[PDB]
Amino acid sequence: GHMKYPVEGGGNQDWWPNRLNLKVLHQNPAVADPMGAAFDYAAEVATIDVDALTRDIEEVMTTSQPWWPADYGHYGPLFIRMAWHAAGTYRIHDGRGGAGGGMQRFAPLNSWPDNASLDKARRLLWPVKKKYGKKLSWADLIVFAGNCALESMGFKTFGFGFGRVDQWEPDEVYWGKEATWLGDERYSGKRDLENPLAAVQMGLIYVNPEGPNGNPDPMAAAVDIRETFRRMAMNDVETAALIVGGHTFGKTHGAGPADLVGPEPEAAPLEQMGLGWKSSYGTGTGKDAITSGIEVVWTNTPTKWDNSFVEILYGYEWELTKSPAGAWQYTAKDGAGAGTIPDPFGGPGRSPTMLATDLSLRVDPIYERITRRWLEHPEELADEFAKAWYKLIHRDMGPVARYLGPLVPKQTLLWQDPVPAVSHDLVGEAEIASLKSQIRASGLTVSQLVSTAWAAASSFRGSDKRGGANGGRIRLQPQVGWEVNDPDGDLRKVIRTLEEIQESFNSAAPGNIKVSFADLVVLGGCAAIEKAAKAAGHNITVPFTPGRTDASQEQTDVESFAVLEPKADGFRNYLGKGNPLPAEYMLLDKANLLTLSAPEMTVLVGGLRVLGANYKRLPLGVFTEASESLTNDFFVNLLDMGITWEPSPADDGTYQGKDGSGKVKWTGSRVDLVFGSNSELRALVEVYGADDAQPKFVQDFVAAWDKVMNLDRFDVR
Amino acid sequence: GHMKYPVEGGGNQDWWPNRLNLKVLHQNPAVADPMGAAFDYAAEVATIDVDALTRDIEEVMTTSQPWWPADYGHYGPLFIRMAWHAAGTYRIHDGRGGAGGGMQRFAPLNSWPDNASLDKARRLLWPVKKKYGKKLSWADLIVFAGNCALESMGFKTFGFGFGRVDQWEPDEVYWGKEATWLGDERYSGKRDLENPLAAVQMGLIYVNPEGPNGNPDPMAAAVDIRETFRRMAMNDVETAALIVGGHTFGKTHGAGPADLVGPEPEAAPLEQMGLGWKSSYGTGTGKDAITSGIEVVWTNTPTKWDNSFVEILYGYEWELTKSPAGAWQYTAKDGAGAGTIPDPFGGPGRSPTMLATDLSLRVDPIYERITRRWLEHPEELADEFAKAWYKLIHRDMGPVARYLGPLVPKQTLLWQDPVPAVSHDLVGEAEIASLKSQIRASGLTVSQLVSTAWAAASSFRGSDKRGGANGGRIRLQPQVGWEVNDPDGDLRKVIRTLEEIQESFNSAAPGNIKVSFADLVVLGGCAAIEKAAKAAGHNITVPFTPGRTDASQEQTDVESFAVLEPKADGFRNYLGKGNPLPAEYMLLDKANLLTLSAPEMTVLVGGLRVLGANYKRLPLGVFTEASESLTNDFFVNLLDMGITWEPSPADDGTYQGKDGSGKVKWTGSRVDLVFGSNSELRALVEVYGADDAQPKFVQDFVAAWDKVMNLDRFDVR
Ligand code: HEM
Ligand code: HEM
Ligand code: NA
Ligand code: NA
């Protein structure tokens, strides 16, 4: 090999391929943002003329462009595929992917094999982006176009929320280990798909349209469909409705041999203006288009909503055949239905065809019961598809406070993890100060209050904006039983004591002021940090913003919240089972899910350690003689060369720090020691460990703590 | 091969290994900075107590620590090597390397083979860093410790300037293509070292201490010493003075076999706390230390300044021998001087020894004349070593205004590219407004005024902070003759006209007011932009900061400025010969040298195209119907899918853009089309090409233009 210039990718990872990469903590940096610090997308959206935008998109859909002519004179079906693929990268294990960031317009997503021809689809929408400018993000426009396509062709949607802020460099996500496009090294056992992946091959959205590993077995395909769609939060009914609703429209494209199609966009020459897959087969577009290599038109009305998909699926019998490009597909036996399917550009009619994965909807016994019902009750298909499409397009939107615009339906939905609206006045300064005194008098310790507030708030992940302290779900299933929240420990005791303080305050509060349990959990940790700071000689106030409300168990989908359980939390020195990488890599990944920077991660680790937030109160990394006071002792002692560190004499993967005499003075984990070992992290530790640093450390810790407490608080932003 | 998690380095560069990498435009981002917004290091170190700092460094140097015992009870010599190595990565071709960023504490430099044991040297100075905190950067401390070491051991230095600002992630620099440490794939012809490299092997500072490629021929080693030191801005006398002065102190380390030495720091295990090269030979430290593998003690007084080096070099005849580690070195013949050299820890005396590169100073005829002079008159060595050392550790400090503290010497120095002090009152806003009016009436076109101002200001490079518009050197050699600056003889007219305006204004100036030619060059460009903005329907004021002064030719080292001539400037669509990468890669490298972000680079390109700033006024990229008018037409037309782009029939790296009628409408270069092709850059073009974007584009362009104009203006910052 050869090292390259940095402008062509060269860097330190070339010399140390397995090295920790702190760059995951400065994605989408502000310097790369052309918007400027004061840009307020929520304010811009609040002025869009949605009616005019809808009409402009309708005009785009029906004005064929010569560099990519419109099938059946309507770009609508292409836009529905575009939006489904935009939202279709989402996965429940880490919440990454989805349409919330407009990542389809960036690498690697813009060059995935499954996203072929969507470069043209996005390009066709520039006249709309041009007209509305900063008032309309690409992220919102890409999925709104699909929604507009559905409605222009006869399907009434449940609603739509704006508010996806455009980003300026791609979100870097692990999509699999395979170094070859469409590769498959992600299965073990019978058919166990590797966590956290939610597609069957590298570069696919969900499953292979020719069946598993190219084998058109519809029964086996249904196994992959059920599992990948499950990992995108869709059940059997939602999955069938989505696939039936989608393939009601449009067609596939495989008019000629695939080896006439040029490189994907990121590998394409300059003159192609960011487009890829340039084909030399005929015109390369339109009637000669090659996208997937399959040549299927599902229904006889590809630009209209109706029930002809299930009517055709159950109306014919199906046999295996090949497309002009050599891909497996199915067509009606016995020449049935010849000439009944229209051609996109006025040619002769064709025969009915289906993908192997479409036939899964009829061959799989669960899908068959669902889809056969819709033969005589298409009103139930329309209702399920509207609910599933709405959930698909908004899955990573977070709390409903973020949904913007005039098309947001206000019905509450269980999958949105709803919290009640506020129904009383909120606590003010005098009540907050009075609730703080009850907490100090309750006997709850700094460790208990800090650990409980962190456990509730650190369930947030910025990937799909789920979790957080709002809802007070730490006292509900499944969070109250999570191992890292330690049900065996004081958690139930802390919950009971906080509920007593809540009831006690609410029975004598002024006016109709009342405090929620969810607010009291956060307030307790804030009050404990104020006490711990004073105990170290710092008079500081921790910010506190009220307004969290208390969800009930009936409003908390227990199974849905399973994916939010921390399998690792280096901020509590906790490492569960099943993590893909050593503990210091999972620490950085956890900090990324919390939207934390490297300095913010560093102050929080050092602070939480000396506050007693550790899992099971382990002494690992507690480099202080003044526990439960907020000092910078963690950083001072970590940089002390009077300590000699060694792997423990037990073979448990921890470390022993010995002083000059040989006595073990400290113990620590990989998460603890990486801050004194990694050269970029140690640079940060040396800032907070200096003689002048303790006021700055306390200030920075409180700021990072306040950030974590407020991660899900879009209701007051 | 397999793809990896982003937290383990995985990213888009794995899938497209040669893709344009915009990371070079968001290095050291603010979010990774622990110091925050208003932190001003210059303000901090300006109040440091230098006398106390020197005594604290003095105590560190004479207090041996058990994990790395001090040779001869004094760490001074180790700190001199540390400081020399910190500054020793600088190279003239692109100004990168040097000690100005403290990069020796980060990868890859902290793990270079030549920087072995310097991990321990930096570690010894944490007590000093800890005591002074944010008032003292690691960047300053590393070279100041070497400067204090010289003084502590009897050498009076020329002075010292503080002000090197610490960074928080490594600057990524092309150090060579070799993928193996100590590799050599950088020579062509007889012995032409690859530009921009200034070292003979990957991971070396300058030359191989065993001779070229490990062959101990002193005459051949002198060839490599002369060329690499030349590429580090040192002539023959400076080179010899540095080597003689340096090896007056200390010893090499090679007590045992080198395969007992463990991995470099970035590959070392956690328990070693960022240190590397852990050795299992004896104690692995002190008398058993293994650093380079050579075991040489140059002088009989390793902790004292005297003339021992050349006395020993010429007082013995030398023969080739081997160190205990198998490295080539020289020792005195016939057992001469046995037992005359002291042992670092009290062992028996040793015989005189020298490196093969030390013998170059006697074998090479140029070096021999220089070093025999110091054998006869040692007073001249102290003078030359002091001047070369001060230059070494300040070479990348930029304008003299950046030198802070009470140790800064007042003397003018040619290598600093000095500019005269302001001796008059500066023009006020009334005089600025008048001068802008006179420039716009002078008959100089907007193209001429913008081209000349950019040519003067864009000579700056942030790597070593050389160049820029201050000094008015656009009218002096060599800048007045650079191909990109004066292609067809137009620049002479522009200079004479601005000089006439300068003479006229100063003759009639009120009071003590005087304006410089250097300021007028910049002010002319700002007036031209105000005019072009009005032509496009935007009344705007371009900011201007007076205070530049006019350097003379006698104050302008003509050959030193040769490395600042652009071989490529995508902002003017100029591409000379000898570039290592295609033009769009050179564009990003240039923007990096101008310290520009990707949005700033994007607005400047689109603006300078329509302002007529292209080299030779080529129509490449001038996508507008209205030249001399500041519009966003570059971005609107670049996004126009009514244009079809193809490579020009002549394979000259240009493109033709044909509109609907197949007629050629626009032409462009690779630099132009990359903004419509690259997915991240096109996202920026779509911001500035929208209907709502004309006011924002004019604001952002003017701010970006003003930034480039003020790049070297450290006199006001
Ligand atoms: C098992 C799940 C699915 C598979 C295997 C699959 C596969 C495919 C393939 C291979 C194509 C042809 C692309 C081409 O050659 O142009 C296609 C087209 C399309 N897909 Fe799907 N898809 C699935 C689910 C969905 C869903 C859930 C939706 C929307 C809710 C959808 C909407 C569409 C539409 C509208 C088209 C037509 C595109 C056009 O007319 O250009 N699909 N699908
Ligand atoms: C051709 C140029 C040079 C070569 C090949 C060279 C090479 C070396 C080598 C191999 C070592 C031994 C490292 C070890 O094993 O610990 C060393 C040590 C040292 N170098 Fe140089 N060097 C050069 C120039 C310089 C310069 C210009 C300076 C300072 C102005 C300098 C200052 C030192 C000092 C003070 C030591 C002793 C370090 C100690 O005692 O630990 N050298 N050099
Ligand atoms: Na996501
Ligand atoms: Na530099």
* DSSP string for A599-624: HHHHHHHHHHHHHT-SGGG--TT---
Distance from CA of A194 to the nearest CA of B (A): 14
Distance separating alpha carbons of residues A358 and A349, to the nearest angstrom: 21
Please name the helix (run of DSSP H) or strand (run of DSSP E) that holds residue A568, with its range, or none.
strand A568-569
Residue B670 CA, ligand 4 centroid: distance in Å: 28
CA-based nearest residue to A582, from A591, A592, A570, A593 = A570
CA-based nearest residue to A146, from A219, A84, A101 = A84
Task: Name the phi and psi angles at A227, rounded to 5.
Answer: -75, -45
CB contact under 8 A, A132 and B172: no
Q: After which residues is chain A broken (C to N over 2.5 A)?
A: none
Distance separating alpha carbons of residues B226 and B654, to the nearest angstrom: 41
Which DSSP string do the residues of B533-581 spell out, in sequence order? HHHTT------------B--GGGS-TTGGGGGS-SEEGGGTEE-S--SS
- Ligand 1: lining residues by beta carbon, under 6 Å: A 71, 77-78, 80-81, 84, 117, 206-207, 209, 225, 242-243, 245-247, 249-253, 291-292, 294, 357
Other beta carbons within 10 angstroms of residue B16's beta carbon come to: 17
Q: Are B105 and B138 contacting, i.e. CB atoms less than 8 angstroms apart?
A: yes
Q: Are A340 and A300 contacting, i.e. CB atoms less than 8 angstroms apart?
A: yes
CB contact under 8 A, A108 and B266: no
Strands (E), A255-395: 318-322, 328-332, 353-354
Which DSSP string do the residues of B414-440 spell out, in sequence order? GGG---PPP-SBPP-HHHHHHHHHHHH
Delimit the CATH 1.10.420.10 region(s) of chain B: 187-382, 570-703
Relative orientation angle of helices A598-611 and A517-535, to the nearest 10 degrees: 80
What is residue A657's DSSP assignment? E
| Matching residue, tokens 């007056």 | B248
Can you read off the two tokens belonging to residue A444?
């709850």
Beta partners for residue B232, in sequence order: none
Distance separating alpha carbons of residues A494 and A455, to the nearest angstrom: 12
One-letter amino acid at A219 equals: M
CB pairs under 8 A between A and B: 320
Please name the helix (run of DSSP H) or strand (run of DSSP E) that holds residue B319, with its range, or none.
strand B318-322
Catalytic option among A68, A138, A175, A298: A298
Q: Are B68 and B285 contacting, i.e. CB atoms less than 8 angstroms apart?
A: yes
One-letter amino acid at B107 equals: A
Q: B494, exposed or middle or buried, with CB in 10 Å at 0-12, 13-18, 19+? A: buried
Q: Which residue of B has its CA nearest to A184?
A: B2
CATH T-level topology, domain B570-703: Peroxidase; domain 2 (1.10.420)
CA-based nearest residue to B603, from A34, A550, A423, A212 = A34
Chain B residues inside the 8 Å CB shell of A129: 686, 690
Q: Are A160 and A405 contacting, i.e. CB atoms less than 8 angstroms apart?
A: yes
Architecture of the domain defined by A211-388: Orthogonal Bundle (1.10)
What is residue B330's DSSP assignment? E
CATH code for the part of the protein at B187-382: 1.10.420.10
C-alpha dihedral (A205, A211, A212, A214), degrees to nearest 10? -100
Distance separating alpha carbons of residues A259 and A261, to the nearest angstrom: 5
Beta strand A664-668 with B187-188 is unpaired
What is residue B488's DSSP assignment? S
Distance from CA of A613 to the nearest CA of B (A): 23
What is residue A10's DSSP assignment? -
Helices (H) and strands (E) in chain A, counts: 23, 10
Annotated binding residue B247: yes
When CB atoms are compared, the residue of B10, B110, B202 closest to A679 is B110
Chain B residues inside the 8 Å CB shell of A680: 106, 168-170
Distance separating alpha carbons of residues A36 and A38, to the nearest angstrom: 6
| Matching residue, tokens 């959990």 | A521
Is the beta carbon of B207 within 6 A of some atom in ligand 2? yes
One-letter amino acid at B476 equals: L
Instruction: Determine if residue B173 is left, alpha or beta; phi over 0 gives left, psi from -120 to 50 gives alpha, anything else beta.
Output: beta
Delimit the CATH 1.10.420.10 region(s) of chain A: 211-388
Contacts of B645 (CB under 8 A, 6+ apart): A270, A271, A272, A273, B655, B656, B657, B658, B668, B673
Beta partners for residue A404, in sequence order: A162
Relative orientation angle of helices A670-677 and A583-593, to the nearest 10 degrees: 90
Residue A321 CA from chain centroid, whole number: 38
- Residue having the nearest C-alpha atom to atom 2 of ligand 2: B243
Q: Are A418 and A401 contacting, i.e. CB atoms less than 8 angstroms apart?
A: no
Q: Are B603 and B37 contacting, i.e. CB atoms less than 8 angstroms apart?
A: no
Chain B residues inside the 8 Å CB shell of A599: 32-34
Delimit the CATH 1.10.520.10 region(s) of chain A: 429-716
Q: Is A655 helix (H, G, I), strand (E, B) or coil?
A: strand
One-letter amino acid at A715 equals: D
CA-based nearest residue to A402, from A700, A76, A715, A627 = A715
C-alpha dihedral (A505, A506, A507, A511), degrees to nearest 10? 110
Task: Name the phi and psi angles at B19, rounded to 5.
Answer: -70, 145
CB contact under 8 A, A178 and B30: no
Q: Are A130 and B690 contacting, i.e. CB atoms less than 8 angstroms apart?
A: yes
When CB atoms are compared, the residue of A24, A644, A700 closest to B7 is A24
Question: CA distances (Å), A294 to each of A330, A508, B551, in order?
Answer: 10, 70, 71
Q: How many CA atoms lie within 13 A of A703 on its CB side?
A: 15
Beta strand A353-354 with A644-647 is unpaired
A253 is catalytic: no
Is the beta carbon of B657 within 6 A of some atom in ligand 2? no
Beta strand B328-332 with B353-354 is antiparallel
Which DSSP string do the residues of A54-102 spell out, in sequence order? HHHHHHHHTS-BTTBPPGGG--HHHHHHHHHHHHTT--TTT---SSTT-
Experimental method reported for this structure:
X-ray
One-letter amino acid at B397 equals: M
Beta partners for residue A513, in sequence order: A425
- Residue having the nearest C-alpha atom to atom 28 of ligand 2: B246
Q: Are A688 and A697 contacting, i.e. CB atoms less than 8 angstroms apart?
A: yes
Q: Are A395 and A413 contacting, i.e. CB atoms less than 8 angstroms apart?
A: no
Relative orientation angle of helices B76-87 and B138-152, to the nearest 10 degrees: 130
Please name the helix (run of DSSP H) or strand (run of DSSP E) that holds residue B119, with its range, or none.
helix B118-123
Q: A130, exposed or middle or buried, with CB in 10 Å at 0-12, 13-18, 19+? A: middle
Q: Are A449 and A578 contacting, i.e. CB atoms less than 8 angstroms apart?
A: no
Residue B249 CA, ligand 2 centroid: distance in Å: 9
Chain B residues inside the 8 Å CB shell of A602: 34
For chain B, how big is the Rg over CA atoms in Å?
Answer: 28
CA-based nearest residue to A404, from A594, A144, A635 = A144
Which DSSP string do the residues of A173-241 spell out, in sequence order? ----S-SSTT----EETTTEEPTT--SSSTT-SSS-TTSGGG---HHHHHHHHHHHHHTTT--HHHHHH
Relative orientation angle of helices B446-457 and B694-709, to the nearest 10 degrees: 50
Task: Name the phi and psi angles at B657, rounded to 5.
Answer: -110, 110
Is the beta carbon of B598 within 6 A of some atom in ligand 2? no
Q: Is B528 helix (H, G, I), strand (E, B) or coil?
A: helix
Beta partners for residue B666, in sequence order: B657
Residue A80 CA, ligand 1 centroid: distance in Å: 9
Question: CA distances (Å), A594 to each of A449, A464, A707, A713, B569, in order?
Answer: 20, 11, 9, 13, 42
Distance separating alpha carbons of residues A524 and B169, to the nearest angstrom: 37
Please name the helix (run of DSSP H) or strand (run of DSSP E) that holds residue B669, with its range, or none.
strand B664-669
Chain A residues inside the 8 Å CB shell of B273: 641, 645, 673, 676-677, 682
Bond before A108 cis per omega within 30 degrees: yes
Distance separating alpha carbons of residues B414 and B20, to the nearest angstrom: 38
Contacts of A376 (CB under 8 A, 6+ apart): none
For chain A, how big is the Rg over CA atoms in Å?
Answer: 28
One-letter amino acid at A414 equals: L
- Domain A429-716 = CATH 3.40.30.10: no
Q: Is B699 helix (H, G, I), strand (E, B) or coil?
A: helix
When CB atoms are compared, the residue of A15, A131, A678 closest to B108 is A15
- Ligand 2 pocket test target in B74, B75, B84, B261 with most atoms within 8 Å of CB: B84
When CB atoms are compared, the residue of B170, B177, B691 closest to A131 is B691
Q: Which residue of B has its CA nearest to A687?
A: B133
CA-based nearest residue to A20, from A460, A592, A666, A619 = A592
- Residue having the nearest C-alpha atom to atom 42 of ligand 2: B246
Q: Which residue of A has its CA nearest to B700?
A: A34
Distance separating alpha carbons of residues A135 and B473, to the nearest angstrom: 46
Chain B residues inside the 8 Å CB shell of A121: none
Distance separating alpha carbons of residues B78 and B153, to the nearest angstrom: 12
Nearest-ligand number for the alpha carbon of B358: 2
When CB atoms are compared, the residue of A32, A175, A585 closest to B598 is A32
Q: Is B458 helix (H, G, I), strand (E, B) or coil?
A: coil
Task: Name the phi and psi angles at B470, rounded to 5.
Answer: -65, 140
What is residue B469's DSSP assignment? S
Instruction: Determine if residue B5 is left, alpha or beta; phi over 0 gives left, psi from -120 to 50 gives alpha, anything else beta.
Output: beta
Catalytic residue annotation of B? 85, 298
CA-based nearest residue to B646, from B617, B678, B680, B673 = B673
Distance separating alpha carbons of residues A699 and A542, to the nearest angstrom: 9
CA-based nearest residue to A86, from A122, A137, A131 = A122
One-letter amino acid at A166 equals: D
Distance separating alpha carbons of residues A225 and A218, to the nearest angstrom: 10
Q: Are A570 and A590 contacting, i.e. CB atoms less than 8 angstroms apart?
A: yes
CB contact under 8 A, B686 and A126: yes
Architecture of the domain defined by B429-565: Orthogonal Bundle (1.10)
Which DSSP string do the residues of B76-112 spell out, in sequence order? HHHHHHHHHHHHTT--TTT---SSTT-GGGSTTGGG-
Other beta carbons within 10 angstroms of residue B377's beta carbon come to: 10
CB contact under 8 A, B673 and A175: no
CB contact under 8 A, B9 and A26: no
Q: How many CA atoms lie within 13 A of A187 on its CB side?
A: 14
Nearest-ligand number for the alpha carbon of A353: 1
Relative orientation angle of helices A76-87 and A236-247, to the nearest 10 degrees: 150
CB contact under 8 A, A176 and B592: no
- Residue having the nearest C-alpha atom to atom 7 of ligand 1: A209
Distance from CA of A5 to the nearest CA of B (A): 5
One-letter amino acid at A504 equals: S
Strands (E), A278-354: 318-322, 328-332, 353-354
Q: A269, exposed or middle or buried, with CB in 10 Å at 0-12, 13-18, 19+? A: middle
